[PDB]
Ligand binder design. Sequence first.
Ligand SMILES: *[C@@H]1O[C@H](CO[C@@H]2O[C@@H](C)[C@@H](O)[C@@H](O)[C@@H]2O)[C@@H](O[C@@H]2O[C@H](CO)[C@@H](O)[C@H](O)[C@H]2NC(C)=O)[C@H](O)[C@H]1NC(C)=O
Ligand SMILES: *[C@@H]1O[C@H](CO[C@@H]2O[C@@H](C)[C@@H](O)[C@@H](O)[C@@H]2O)[C@@H](O[C@@H]2O[C@H](CO)[C@@H](O)[C@H](O)[C@H]2NC(C)=O)[C@H](O)[C@H]1NC(C)=O
Ligand SMILES: *[C@@H]1O[C@H](CO[C@@H]2O[C@@H](C)[C@@H](O)[C@@H](O)[C@@H]2O)[C@@H](O[C@@H]2O[C@H](CO)[C@@H](O)[C@H](O)[C@H]2NC(C)=O)[C@H](O)[C@H]1NC(C)=O
Ligand SMILES: *[C@@H]1O[C@H](CO[C@@H]2O[C@@H](C)[C@@H](O)[C@@H](O)[C@@H]2O)[C@@H](O[C@@H]2O[C@H](CO)[C@@H](O)[C@H](O)[C@H]2NC(C)=O)[C@H](O)[C@H]1NC(C)=O
Ligand SMILES: *[C@@H]1O[C@H](CO[C@@H]2O[C@@H](C)[C@@H](O)[C@@H](O)[C@@H]2O)[C@@H](O[C@@H]2O[C@H](CO)[C@@H](O)[C@H](O)[C@H]2NC(C)=O)[C@H](O)[C@H]1NC(C)=O
Ligand SMILES: *[C@@H]1O[C@H](CO[C@@H]2O[C@@H](C)[C@@H](O)[C@@H](O)[C@@H]2O)[C@@H](O[C@@H]2O[C@H](CO)[C@@H](O)[C@H](O)[C@H]2NC(C)=O)[C@H](O)[C@H]1NC(C)=O
Ligand SMILES: *[C@@H]1O[C@H](CO[C@@H]2O[C@@H](C)[C@@H](O)[C@@H](O)[C@@H]2O)[C@@H](O[C@@H]2O[C@H](CO)[C@@H](O)[C@H](O)[C@H]2NC(C)=O)[C@H](O)[C@H]1NC(C)=O
Ligand SMILES: *[C@@H]1O[C@H](CO[C@@H]2O[C@@H](C)[C@@H](O)[C@@H](O)[C@@H]2O)[C@@H](O[C@@H]2O[C@H](CO)[C@@H](O)[C@H](O)[C@H]2NC(C)=O)[C@H](O)[C@H]1NC(C)=O
Ligand code: CA
Ligand code: CA
Ligand code: CA
Ligand code: CA
Lengths: 388, 388, 388, 388
Amino acid sequence: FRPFKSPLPLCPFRGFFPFHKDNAIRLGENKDVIVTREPYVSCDNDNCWSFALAQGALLGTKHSNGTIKDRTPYRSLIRFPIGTAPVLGNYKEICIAWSSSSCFDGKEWMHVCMTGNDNDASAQIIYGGRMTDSIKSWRKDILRTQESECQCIDGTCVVAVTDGPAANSADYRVYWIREGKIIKYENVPKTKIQYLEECSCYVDIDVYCICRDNWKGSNRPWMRINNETILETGYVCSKFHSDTPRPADPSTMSCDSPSNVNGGPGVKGFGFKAGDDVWLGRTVSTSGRSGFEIIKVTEGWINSPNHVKSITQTLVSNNDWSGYSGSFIVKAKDCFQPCFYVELIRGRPNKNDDVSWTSNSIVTFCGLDNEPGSGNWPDGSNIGFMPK
Amino acid sequence: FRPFKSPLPLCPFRGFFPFHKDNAIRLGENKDVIVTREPYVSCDNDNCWSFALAQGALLGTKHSNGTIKDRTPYRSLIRFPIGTAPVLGNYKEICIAWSSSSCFDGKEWMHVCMTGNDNDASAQIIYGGRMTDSIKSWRKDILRTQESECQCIDGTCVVAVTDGPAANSADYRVYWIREGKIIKYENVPKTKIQYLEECSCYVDIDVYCICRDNWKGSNRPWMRINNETILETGYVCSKFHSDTPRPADPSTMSCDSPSNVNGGPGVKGFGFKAGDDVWLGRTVSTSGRSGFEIIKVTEGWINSPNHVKSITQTLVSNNDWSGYSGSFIVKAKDCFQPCFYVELIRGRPNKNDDVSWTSNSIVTFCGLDNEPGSGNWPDGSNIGFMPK
Amino acid sequence: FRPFKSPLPLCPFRGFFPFHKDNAIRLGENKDVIVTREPYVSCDNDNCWSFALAQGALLGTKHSNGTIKDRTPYRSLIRFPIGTAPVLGNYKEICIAWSSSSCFDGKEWMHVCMTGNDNDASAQIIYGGRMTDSIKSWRKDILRTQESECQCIDGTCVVAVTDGPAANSADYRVYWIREGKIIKYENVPKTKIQYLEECSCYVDIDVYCICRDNWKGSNRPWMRINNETILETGYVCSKFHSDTPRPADPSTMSCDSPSNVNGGPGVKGFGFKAGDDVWLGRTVSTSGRSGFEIIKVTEGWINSPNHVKSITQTLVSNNDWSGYSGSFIVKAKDCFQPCFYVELIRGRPNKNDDVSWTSNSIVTFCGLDNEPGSGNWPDGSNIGFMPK
Amino acid sequence: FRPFKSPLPLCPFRGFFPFHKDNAIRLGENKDVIVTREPYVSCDNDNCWSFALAQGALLGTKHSNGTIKDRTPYRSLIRFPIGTAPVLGNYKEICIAWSSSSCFDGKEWMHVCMTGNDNDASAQIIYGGRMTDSIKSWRKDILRTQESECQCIDGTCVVAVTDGPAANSADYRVYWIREGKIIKYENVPKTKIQYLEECSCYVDIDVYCICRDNWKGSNRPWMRINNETILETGYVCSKFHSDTPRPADPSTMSCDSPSNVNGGPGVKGFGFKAGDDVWLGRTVSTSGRSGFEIIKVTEGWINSPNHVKSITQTLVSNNDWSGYSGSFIVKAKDCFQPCFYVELIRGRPNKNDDVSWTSNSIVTFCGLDNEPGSGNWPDGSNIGFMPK
Ligand SMILES: *[C@@H]1O[C@H](CO[C@@H]2O[C@@H](C)[C@@H](O)[C@@H](O)[C@@H]2O)[C@@H](O[C@@H]2O[C@H](CO)[C@@H](O)[C@H](O)[C@H]2NC(C)=O)[C@H](O)[C@H]1NC(C)=O
Ligand SMILES: *[C@@H]1O[C@H](CO[C@@H]2O[C@@H](C)[C@@H](O)[C@@H](O)[C@@H]2O)[C@@H](O[C@@H]2O[C@H](CO)[C@@H](O)[C@H](O)[C@H]2NC(C)=O)[C@H](O)[C@H]1NC(C)=O
Ligand SMILES: *[C@@H]1O[C@H](CO[C@@H]2O[C@@H](C)[C@@H](O)[C@@H](O)[C@@H]2O)[C@@H](O[C@@H]2O[C@H](CO)[C@@H](O)[C@H](O)[C@H]2NC(C)=O)[C@H](O)[C@H]1NC(C)=O
Ligand SMILES: *[C@@H]1O[C@H](CO[C@@H]2O[C@@H](C)[C@@H](O)[C@@H](O)[C@@H]2O)[C@@H](O[C@@H]2O[C@H](CO)[C@@H](O)[C@H](O)[C@H]2NC(C)=O)[C@H](O)[C@H]1NC(C)=O
Ligand SMILES: *[C@@H]1O[C@H](CO[C@@H]2O[C@@H](C)[C@@H](O)[C@@H](O)[C@@H]2O)[C@@H](O[C@@H]2O[C@H](CO)[C@@H](O)[C@H](O)[C@H]2NC(C)=O)[C@H](O)[C@H]1NC(C)=O
Ligand SMILES: *[C@@H]1O[C@H](CO[C@@H]2O[C@@H](C)[C@@H](O)[C@@H](O)[C@@H]2O)[C@@H](O[C@@H]2O[C@H](CO)[C@@H](O)[C@H](O)[C@H]2NC(C)=O)[C@H](O)[C@H]1NC(C)=O
Ligand SMILES: *[C@@H]1O[C@H](CO[C@@H]2O[C@@H](C)[C@@H](O)[C@@H](O)[C@@H]2O)[C@@H](O[C@@H]2O[C@H](CO)[C@@H](O)[C@H](O)[C@H]2NC(C)=O)[C@H](O)[C@H]1NC(C)=O
Ligand SMILES: *[C@@H]1O[C@H](CO[C@@H]2O[C@@H](C)[C@@H](O)[C@@H](O)[C@@H]2O)[C@@H](O[C@@H]2O[C@H](CO)[C@@H](O)[C@H](O)[C@H]2NC(C)=O)[C@H](O)[C@H]1NC(C)=O
Ligand SMILES: [Ca+2]
Ligand SMILES: [Ca+2]
Ligand SMILES: [Ca+2]
Ligand SMILES: [Ca+2]
């Protein structure tokens, strides 16, 4: 018997520390590793797990040629031990999916899995391994979800779902799901947020989601959500923006609207509110998906003339490829510890990755109330050693 | 402590949704995957599992040459995580078998495994991992069983077993087995059913089995069974037939006899009675094992002038190979959810699959009381990429 | 909490039925499988397991060349799921060993593992994964044990151990071990038995062991043992002998001494006393390790003029290689079910197995009180397909 | 519910016996095995486990070229079943690490993982799978730890940590950690010990650590520690030294200071105090990392004119490569059994290992109060068979 996960505050932290790293591309040199992208991490009562969207092919085989393609019927959400490379001998297949989210409610896993035609997709809700509910595409344009962990409070899980065009109009919703049954949904208000995709969420009493505006905002949109409703929305105030591409630091402080510059295409990313301050992950490059750093911006959560980057940890050098990044939480004593993963994409379309496939490895970090050291934890593969 | 599975009704449903897909042939390009055919799915209290008859060889090796052959001593029933490809690092060997059925009674797994010479086979009954009973061939002509899950109610498992020629006379029986001990059997009445093989069964209070007539019927025979006896028998009334080959729609309504057209060879398939209606899986082709669709036929379970195909979901295109299909159930709150798998056969004898082996992948779907979208989930292998 | 295994009688049986088969050599064609020999089977409360002496090399690699050699420091007792091929992704290493025995006492596994120099070996006793005791070679000539499961009654495990020359003098002992601690040993009386090695044991209230005389007896020596002492000894009375080599049927009835013909080298084998009758496994060939059959000899356990082979099941044809065979038991309701495995050796020194390695696969059978069918379950590998 | 491990005495023993051996290099001939070094063993309530620092590459692949390098971001502490080779299908990734220690407190695993830049490393403390605390490099010169198991008494784990130069000044500390939270640390007194690295520890009521002086001592430094503080320190009195390199036997008795001869570079090793006597592991060679033997020195723990080598077991011949060695304990009834592992390094820089990689296999031994036999258990690989 296990209770449902509760609404705990975020633990205090002052830096991020290297946790797990899978070295999946390096370890895939002899064709053992499953091709993936859009990885994330989520934990149950006992263990943290790696999740990713597999491509139904082994890295370096002929079927891996062309895996830059985002949506195929051969993509499945898979789970494998955290920090391990995904191989046929260690993975589990969760569901057929080209977009997904997963979260553990304290008793069972819930997953949200989208698959099917772009104009007629459906999301399958899996709870305790059983398919319990579904969502039908209502805008017939790539029904899609977080690509990282959802969050559950007192038995009700909250997940962000989008249907509609990129870089233009589109519907953005939150769904509330309890024991695998959809309870209700809300259309996200568009008073502030103009575009929202690929939300990265965590719990700090309430659920906070920091997402991707792929049209007009180089600043990230966000929502605060509880077990019943959407409480607040906005864009991250920080004049130091954290999407990619983005303007050079320092840029504009826009708490209530997109920056209206360098809006697309964006990249999935995350952040953590801490009092009036905010921590934001971002690529080191302002233009491309290279490097990864996390910054703390003093008073960055609020409207203030005092935004300053008080801390910058460079975790993946700008000479190394990155990709999506997302938040996850780990229960501590009476608080949730903030953690994140970084997707390290290798292959197409990265300049000079002369192989025909596209895949990734993973690195992860967790927050502690201690001072960090420094290092660099990139994918580490020599692309010239790899089967093409 | 777990109770025996009970006689629950089928859940309401109005469409089928993509669940798990293993992409086993694609993932087998580098010779990691075990050669199989006749797969199925069955679930215990905690997990659903893939089962299949392995061929005692890895795909693309020299020993895989000629695996079109149905019965050898090197075939074993194996189990592997649902939606995963079967590899040496993840499989379990259940028993030596070239025909099988498995079901979980709420406490333990039962398996029925036939092996040996065509004219002197025996079925081994395995219960909780121990060999507990057996059936000796009494007609000395390929003693054989469902190739999908059996069903257990209140501790008594029911399984269909056949001994005798194809496309001609033969004995068809149901066996009742409790904690691995055979309690009784009955010869299936031949008042209506003329041929019965490869039953696909599920629970809707009672056990319903929809099977394969490989001689005179393009319509499928069926039985309703409880923990003690056979309650009813017939052929599916639907004027839209669901075996392969079969006449073009619309055909004859034959509730009580084979259609007497396009009788053989047939293919293993399934259906679900829903009130007076029936859902039937079938190949898209009326002649060959290509494509897969499921249809709902209004009043298709009964004698009626009003049969109409109210819903048709095309799940595997007619340009893609299919194969056997079968039902399985998953316990929900107070009902059983109807699900099915489709075997996607690649290799011999499929036209233009120029390899020497025969194997399959798996895709699965479950029923929900929601409207589905649309898509296509075929095997997906480029046969020209495969080791021959 | 689990009780110690009790002294139950053997279940009634009238035939043997195919259980698990690993097809390990066939599945090893692509170099995935660990080289082994001297396999056996033993079960705990929940599962049966395969055990074997690995050679510290993968089949078909350069390190597999020369693995006909019996004793090296690179041999370990390994365990893997019953009926699966042993691969790096599924095995467990139990202990360093070039001779072993294992048994489960109802609570924990005990293993006996010999390794080291031929003239200074030691046996390590492992209990619940901990090394708890040891036996030092006292004759300095290949201290060695059963190569199949030992037996435990009411917490005391019994295992046969030999030290000394082949085809000549030597010490034969039984050891009693409780929770991994050696309690006592006895030198086996030489009033009847003249040579004893590689005992195959089972429980029928008491422990019965049927062993290998490698010097003067083509008939098999046997012992009856309880939790304190050796109760009786003899040679199997049956005038149909069951070692290899052996005289043609019918031969001499020798209840109390070796046959004094075709004495060596012998092969590990087994049998089951059933009332006054006996079941004996044997190679089909009277000269070599080819084929496998089991016979029932009426009144074969006793001195009688009425010995007749009432049943003969041929399980591996004489055209196929066999090897060691041994008994194991599986708890049923209030009796122990008799089962056995057969080692199917491929490679050196088998005529026309033109490879440089030596390894095996496994097939297993269990007894039921039903009539069997017939079949053939040999290794099944085409040696010409194998890496040499 | 499990209690914390208690302060038990060491069991009596008079010799060491072969336990588990992985044969990892032999089994890695076909590129299945993960490249490692700095292995060790540690046990929980149920099982013993192998741990090692992986190099994020498979043995014999192009990424394995150059793995002699000690510290990279691609190194992770991994865990795999004891005596098995580490492969993608069986390993778990514990944390990112180029130096580590692990121990089980009776309830959960704790790990200490150092990674990052040489001049700015941090140690992450993992407890029950969660990152709970950290240590920041305070001397900015390769913050580092035991490379073998730490020890926990009554819930408080003790681990030795070093920061600073080799063969010169440096800080050496002990940290006390409880449920993953750092409680306190102490700088090790330098009244006797002048250099301390890579401590091998065990429990004999208190924690005893025997370590490596890499500057001035061919004799090994040691500490005795309890759940609150450092109790005593010294160098092992034995006039037979046990580091590598070292003077030939017999050398100087130095209980309170380094020998001041053959001081560096040293090698990680271990020993066990037994009354006034001491057991010491050492390479057979006095100059290089070849062979392995363990000696008992009568009165070797104390200042005495009577030091004599009463027992010498040669476990790996001087013709075979060895490497690091370390202690671990296994709970027996009311005492802890002393055990050890030996790292068997193959590849660079070993003379005539003409491959581009560096890796290891493992062999292990445990102490019993019985007389041992003799044997040789080296790595066993033919380096000429290996992919380079
Ligand atoms: C939603 O959860 C509340 C409990 O959580 C509190 O209120 C939330 C809206 C949010 O602010 C959390 O951080 C708070 O901790 C549930 O409220 C309980 O309802 C039951 C039944 O009415 C009642 O017996 C309890 O007193 C309430 N508990 C508390 C602490 O107020 C509420 O039912 C949840 N709603 C849904 C739709 O599940
Ligand atoms: C990656 O694949 C491309 C494309 O392969 C072709 O189209 C695929 C959909 C499939 O049908 C393949 O069988 C086809 O070959 C490869 O580019 C092709 O290379 C072949 C052989 O050299 C050549 O005949 C074609 O003209 C090429 N087609 C195109 C459009 O460029 C490419 O070589 C593959 N990359 C690697 C590293 O193998
Ligand atoms: C078969 O099962 C019944 C219980 O199931 C009911 O009857 C079946 C035939 C079928 O119609 C199900 O859908 C029904 O739910 C067992 O009947 C029980 O028998 C015991 C012992 O006699 C008696 O104490 C109970 O009252 C009965 N329970 C009910 C609900 O009637 C019957 O024993 C089973 N038969 C066998 C051979 O196992
Ligand atoms: C698949 O196998 C066939 C048949 O192989 C032959 O018969 C088998 C039972 C076994 O004994 C094999 O060793 C035999 O070679 C292969 O067809 C044969 O190919 C060989 C080599 O080219 C040729 O000498 C024979 O004449 C062929 N035999 C026949 C009856 O056609 C076939 O090539 C294999 N397919 C693949 C893709 O390897
Ligand atoms: C050996 O086991 C007996 C119990 O088993 C019975 O006697 C054996 C020798 C054998 O014949 C079995 O088949 C029988 O079932 C133990 O006897 C018990 O001893 C305890 C302690 O003295 C006593 O309280 C019980 O009454 C005895 N039980 C029975 C059924 O007689 C005996 O202790 C065992 N000996 C050893 C050395 O472990
Ligand atoms: C199996 O091995 C033999 C022997 O290999 C030689 O001795 C071993 C102990 C080891 O030192 C190897 O490196 C040696 O090569 C092989 O027979 C040898 O083959 C080589 C190469 O053709 C030849 O130079 C030697 O003269 C042969 N030695 C002997 C004694 O015959 C044999 O070829 C191997 N078998 C296979 C299938 O590879
Ligand atoms: C450290 O452990 C002691 C108990 O262990 C004893 O003392 C150690 C220093 C060491 O010598 C061991 O070998 C001994 O077995 C803890 O002492 C207990 O403290 C509690 C709370 O004050 C008290 O109720 C008990 O009486 C003490 N138990 C004993 C046996 O004396 C002590 O608390 C531990 N200290 C820390 C910092 O955790
Ligand atoms: C092991 O690696 C060395 C070095 O490889 C070179 O440097 C690496 C960092 C990486 O950049 C590689 O791609 C480089 O090739 C190999 O030595 C090189 O061999 C190549 C090919 O023969 C040659 O062109 C270079 O001159 C060599 N470089 C040096 C410094 O020697 C070496 O061959 C590898 N060993 C094995 C067994 O493959
Ligand atoms: Ca943007
Ligand atoms: Ca038909
Ligand atoms: Ca003999
Ligand atoms: Ca030194």
